Design a protein around this ligand. Structure first.
Ligand SMILES: CCOP(=O)(COc1ccc(C[C@H](NC(=O)O[C@H]2CO[C@H]3OCC[C@H]32)[C@H](O)CN(CC(CC)CC)S(=O)(=O)c2ccc3ncsc3c2)cc1)OCC
Lengths: 99, 99
């Protein structure tokens, strides 16, 4: 579909057997999601933006479904104020910017 | 244009008569540029990102050309990690997400 940007581009995602809401975020290199206790191993990581850095857990090869489109990639989990779908997954669903 | 997301969606902008590079950021409500000199009045504002809040200078009704497309709107100037074009101006240039 086509999503205009008058409001935040929020969509429903499915991850770890749960449904969440997340922003389609072209300014996010990586995908960063609210605290959730996903199974399996992870690696510590720090990601930075406006205001500084936060500590997150990096999970690899995670299946996510975004508006019915399936993707598989790295997800960062931690105390983020907003769930964002980053370019690592947006490319996999064929998302482009158009003007 | 149609812009894929395998790389960062960086474009050239013109503001205050100066060329800069900025990131088309659908996750940003507002447009935030690194420290620079802009003519005219400004008001202090606070904005919040992934790591907390920062202080910025709010410039209203500023002319800015983004990848050949003109906008006139609010530009925030302060210690952002990178120049970002947010939805307040992405809407002005007719930018949508598509997949
Ligand atoms: C409950 C609400 O909490 P909140 O208000 C903050 O909420 C939000 C927090 C973050 C966002 C998304 C964030 N937008 C943002 O900063 O936008 C500012 C300006 O416009 C305003 O609108 C929204 C906030 C204000 C960017 O799209 C993406 N970011 C990187 C960019 C930084 C500008 C480029 C470097 S990233 O997230 O830092 C990030 C993501 C993946 C990644 N992989 C490796 S690094 C790395 C860094 C949206 C809402 O309170 C504060 C605690």
């Amino acid at each position: 579909p086509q999503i205009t940007l008058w409001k935040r581009p929020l969509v429903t995602i499915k991850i770890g057997g749960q449904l969440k809401e997340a922003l389609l975020d072209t300014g996010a290199d990586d995908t960063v999601l609210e605290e959730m206790n996903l199974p399996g191993r992870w690696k510590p990581k720090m990601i930075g933006g406006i205001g500084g850095f936060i500590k997150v857990r990096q999970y690899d090869q995670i299946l996510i479904e975004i508006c019915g489109h399936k993707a598989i990639g790295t997800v960062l989990v931690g105390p983020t104020p907003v769930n964002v779908i980053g370019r690592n997954l947006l490319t996999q669903i064929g998302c482009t910017l158009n003007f």
